[PDB]
Amino acid sequence: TVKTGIAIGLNKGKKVTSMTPAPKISYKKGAASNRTKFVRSLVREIAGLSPYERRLIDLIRNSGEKRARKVAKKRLGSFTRAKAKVEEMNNIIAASRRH
Amino acid sequence: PSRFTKTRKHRGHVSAGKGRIGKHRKHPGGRGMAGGQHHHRINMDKYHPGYFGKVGMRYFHKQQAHFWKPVLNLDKLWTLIPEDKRDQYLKSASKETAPVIDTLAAGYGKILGKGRIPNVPVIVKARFVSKLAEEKIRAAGGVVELIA
Amino acid sequence: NDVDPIELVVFLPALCKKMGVPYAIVKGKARLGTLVNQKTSAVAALTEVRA
Amino acid sequence: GAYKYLEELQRKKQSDVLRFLQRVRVWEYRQKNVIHRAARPTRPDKARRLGYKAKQGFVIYRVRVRRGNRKRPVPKGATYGKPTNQGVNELKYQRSLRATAEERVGRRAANLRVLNSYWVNQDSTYKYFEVILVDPQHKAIRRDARYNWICDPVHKHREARGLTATGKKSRGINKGHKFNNTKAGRRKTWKRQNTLSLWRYRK
Amino acid sequence: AISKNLPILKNHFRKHWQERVKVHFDQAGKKVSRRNARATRAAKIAPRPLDLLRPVVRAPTVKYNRKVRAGRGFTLAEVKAAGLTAAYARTIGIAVDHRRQNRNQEIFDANVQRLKEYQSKIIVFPRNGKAPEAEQVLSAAATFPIAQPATDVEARAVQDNGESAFRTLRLARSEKKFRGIREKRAREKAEAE
RNA sequence: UUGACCUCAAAUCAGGUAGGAGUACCCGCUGAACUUAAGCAUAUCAAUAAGCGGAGGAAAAGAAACCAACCGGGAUUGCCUUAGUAACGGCGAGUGAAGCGGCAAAAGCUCAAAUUUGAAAUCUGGUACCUUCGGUGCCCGAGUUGUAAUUUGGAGAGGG
RNA sequence: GUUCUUUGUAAAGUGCCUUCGAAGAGUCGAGUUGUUUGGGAAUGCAGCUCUAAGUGGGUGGUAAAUUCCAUCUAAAGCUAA
Ligand SMILES: [K+]
Ligand SMILES: [K+]
Ligand SMILES: [Mg+2]
Ligand SMILES: [Mg+2]
Ligand SMILES: [Mg+2]
Ligand SMILES: [Mg+2]
Ligand SMILES: [Mg+2]
Ligand SMILES: [Mg+2]
Ligand SMILES: [Mg+2]
Ligand SMILES: [Mg+2]
Ligand SMILES: [Mg+2]
Ligand SMILES: [Mg+2]
Ligand SMILES: [Mg+2]
Ligand SMILES: [Mg+2]
Ligand SMILES: [Mg+2]
Ligand SMILES: [Mg+2]
Ligand SMILES: [Mg+2]
Ligand SMILES: [Mg+2]
Ligand SMILES: [Mg+2]
Ligand SMILES: [Mg+2]
Ligand SMILES: [Mg+2]
Ligand SMILES: [Mg+2]
Ligand SMILES: [Mg+2]
Ligand SMILES: [Mg+2]
C-alpha cells in the first residue's frame, strides 16, 4: 500500500508520510454487543422459526444446501443474504437435537 | 445598431429583400434539423460526414479529471524557468547545479518532444514523458525524474 | 396477565427462566398499580426483603 | 430495558406469536373507525424511536388506508390524448400510503402537528398505520425546548408538505448521485437547471 | 431547416424559457448589500476577523492534487496536537471538522503549526474583565495565508542512472495490466498435483 | 355490595386550537394537449399550463448510509465553471446532469436504544399570593405500557 | 461602564489504566409493474409479492459468481446566512 512515487502502475501515487488516523467509532456500527447478542438469542427462543426458515431447514435436511441456498436466494434479496440465512439455519440444526 | 441594418434600406420595397415568388414563409423546410436524412441529406453528407449513427463504445460517468494531462512540448521546456534566471542557466551548462523544472507545478502532465533544446542539462520532473522527449533531455545532458 | 399490548411482557417468563429469577403471572396490572401507588404497573419486583 | 426486546421481537413478523397478534389486531382495527384515536401506542418502542413521549401533548391516531394502485379518475377510462398517457389501471401514485394516512390524520386533527407515523398492520384491502402527533398549544410542548420547535408556524402540516420521514422519502430527499434529480427539491432543481442566467457583461 | 456549411447548433430553447430568465441587474446592488452586510457583521460581532481560521488541505483528483488550499475545519487530531479542545477552538474562532482525517504527516504538521500561530497571534478576552479594544483585523485568512509547500530546490545535480523513465512508466503499466493474469498463472503453476 | 383498572362516551364542562383570504417567490400531489419531429404512434412540448393540498419572510435543503479513487476532500444553499459535456434518444427530432476547481455565506447539532432505583428526581391544570411573556406554596391530575438528569457515534458510558 | 448580587464545596473541561460501548424492520434489500431520470441488464418514486443482518448494512454509474479494497452509517429529529 506504500506508493511507488510515479503516476502509473500498481501502487501509483505520491510517496507521503502516512499517519494511520485514529479509528472512528463508526465502522463499528454492526458490532458484537453482548447485550444485543443475548437479546437476539432470547427473542429467537421466544419466537421460533418463520415458515420460510422451517422450509429452509427441511431443505437442508432432505434436499441439500445448494437447493436450500437457491430457495433462500429466492426468498431473501441476494446471494449473500441467502448464504448467511443458510448458515444460520444449519447452525440451528446443529444446536437442535443433533448436537 | 438598428440604423446600420439593411431593413432600414428595405423600407419602401415591398418584399423586404425576401423575394416576390418564394416569400418569407414560416418554416418551408421544417424546423431545426428536420429532414437531415430525407430532404437535407445532401447538406448533411456534405459539410457533415459522420453525423448519423454510432461510432464507438460508451463510458458511463466519465470524469475528465481522470484524463487531465496537459502536454508541454520540449520546444519550450524553458518558459517554465523564469526569464531572469533563464540566461544564467543557459550559460554555465553544468551537470551539477542543473535547473530543476517542475512541469506538474507548471500545470502539465506529459512532456512531449517536438522541438530541440539547447545543450544544457536540465532536471525535468514530470508525471509522464514521451520516449523522444526523454531521449532529447538525456542528449542535452539532463534527466527525467518521475513524480506523482 | 392483562397487559393490553402483550409484547411488553411476553418475553418476561422466558427472561426470568433464562436468568433463574422466580416469576409468577399474576392477575391485575391494576392490582400491581395499587401495590406501587399507580393506576397500573404491569410488573412488580422484589430484589431485597427484610430478615 | 424492555424496548430492546420489543424492537427485536417486532422484527419476527412471521413468527407464530406475531402472526396471532397480527390477526387479532387487524380484526379489531377493521372493526373500529377508519380514523380513530388510539389510547396508547401499539408499538411504544417504535413510538419512542420516532419521537413520541408519554406526556400530555403527545397523541396517537390509528388510520386505515385503501391498498393498491391509484386508478386514473378519468370517466370510462378515456384519457383524451396520446397513447403514452392512456394508462388507467397500472398507475402508482408517487406518494406513500403512509403519507396518505398521516395527511388524513392531520386533516382530522388540524390543531395538532404530525410528528411521525409507523406501520402496524395490513390486510389485502387496507394498510394500518399509527400516527404520532404533538399538541403545539399544550404548555408541556410549548415548554420542553426539545419539542417546542414544532410549535413554530413553519411546521404547519409538514405531513401535507412532505416534511415527515415518509414525505422526505417520497420526495427523494437524500444525499448522493442517486438523488441528483431530487436533492434540494425536484422542481427547484429543474428551475435552476432550466433558468437562463444573463449578466450585465454577458459571458 | 439545414442551411449552408455551418456548425450544428444545439440551442436548447424549445421550452417556455422566457418564463425563467434571470438577468443579474442587481449585481451592483447585491455587491453593495454584501459589503454592507460584512460591515454590520464586523461591527456586531466582537473585534473578530469575520471568519474562522481554516486548515491547509490537499485537493483530491490529480488534476488538482498538486496544489494546496483552504479546507473546511481542523481535524480533532490537529486540534488536540495544537493543545486545544474542539469545543473551545470553535468558540475562539477555529473551524473544526470531525469528518476530515489525518493520513499525511506533512499536512497534519502544517495545520498544527498554523493553529499554534493563530493561538500566538490572537488575544482571547476575559469573560469578566476589562478587554481593551484590540484593533479588529477583518481577515484571519489574510492574517494566515495558505502557502503552497516547496517540493525541490531551484538547481540541483543531474543523477542520471540509465533508468529510462519512459521505459519505467511502460513497465509499470505492463505490470499493472498483467498482474492478475500472472497471479492466476502462478496459482495454476503452484498446483502441486 | 363497595372501591379500582382498561377501553369507550357525554356536557352550552375549564382553557385552547383548525378552517377562510393572499398565493409574486416556496413544499408536494395531479396532470395535458397545442407544438417540434417538415406525416406520425416512442419521443418533444413537459416531469410545463390547467386542477388540488400546505407554509413563511423567505421556503426548502442541511451537518453524509456524501463525493471520491486523490498526496484525498468534508453539512446545506447560490453564482462562475464543469458543459451543450458523460449520457439519454423511431441514437431521429431533440434532450442532458454530476465529482473536482474559484467564489458568496458559513454553524453547528439531538433524540431512541442505559437501572435514578438510596428514593418520578419530570410535567399540564386549578387555586392563593406576588415584583405576572412568569415565580412560589398547596391541591388534584399526567406519568413506571417511562416523565427528568446522564449519552448521540466526532463518540460516549461504568469503575479506579 | 456601574450597583445589589455569589452562584457553588453545584456545573463543566482535560491526562492515565480497565471493562464496555446499547446506534432506528414490512425497514434495508430483492422480484415485478407503472411512472420518471442523462442514469444506460433498469436514476429516483410508488403499488403488489418476498423479506434481512450485525467483523453487519448502503455506496463505489455494465448484469453475475468468487476474492479483496475504499468510503460512509439509512430505515428518527432541529438548525441562521
Ligand atoms: K424560398
Ligand atoms: K389528455
Ligand atoms: Mg428592387
Ligand atoms: Mg409579398
Ligand atoms: Mg393521555
Ligand atoms: Mg388505490
Ligand atoms: Mg366550554
Ligand atoms: Mg407554443
Ligand atoms: Mg409533426
Ligand atoms: Mg408542418
Ligand atoms: Mg397532424
Ligand atoms: Mg399550475
Ligand atoms: Mg404571513
Ligand atoms: Mg434570506
Ligand atoms: Mg426551514
Ligand atoms: Mg452524524
Ligand atoms: Mg459539500
Ligand atoms: Mg467547452
Ligand atoms: Mg426533459
Ligand atoms: Mg457530560
Ligand atoms: Mg441509525
Ligand atoms: Mg405522474
Ligand atoms: Mg465499477
Ligand atoms: Mg428541516
Q: How far apart are CA B109 and CA B107, in angstroms?
A: 7
Q: Considering only residues 36-55 of protein chain E, which place a Cβ less than 7 A from any atom of strand G? A: none
Q: Give the side-chain half-sphere CA count within 13 A for B80.
A: 23
Q: How many domains in chain D?
A: 1
Interrupted after residues, chain A (C–N over 2.5 Å) = none
Alpha helices, DSSP H only, in chain C?
Answer: 7-19, 29-35
Which ligand is the nearest neighbour of the Cα of B31? Answer: 10
Residue D145 belongs to domain with CATH number: 3.40.1120.10
Angle CA(D123)–CA(D129)–CA(D130) in degrees, nearest 5? 145
Which stretch of DSSP H or E encloses residue A89? helix A79-95
Pairing of β B98-102 and β E155-156: antiparallel
Q: How far is the CA of D105 from the centre of ligand 12 (A)?
A: 26
Beta-bridge partner residues of D59 = D133
Q: How far is the CA of D172 from the C1' of F137 (A)?
A: 54
Method of structure determination: cryo-EM
- The residues, any chain, with a CB within 8 Å of residue E179's CB and separated by 6 or more, are A10
Resolution in A: 2.3
Query: How many other CB atoms sit within 10 Å of the CB of residue D10?
Result: 15
Angle CA(D181)–CA(D184)–CA(D186) in degrees, nearest 5? 40
Instruction: Show the domain range for D18.
Output: 1-203
Beta-bridge partner residues of D129 = D63, D119
Q: Which of B25, B39, B45, B47 would best serve as a mutation to test chain E binding (most E beta carbons within 10 A)? A: B47
For residue E102, with 0-12 CB atoms within 10 Å meaning exposed, 13-18 middle and 19 or more buried, which class applies?
buried
Provide CATH code, domain A16-99. Answer: 1.10.10.1760
- The residues, any chain, with a CB within 8 Å of residue A84's CB and separated by 6 or more, are none
- The residues, any chain, with a CB within 8 Å of residue E157's CB and separated by 6 or more, are B95, B96, B97, B98
Q: How far is the CA of D84 from the C1' of F62 (A)?
A: 38
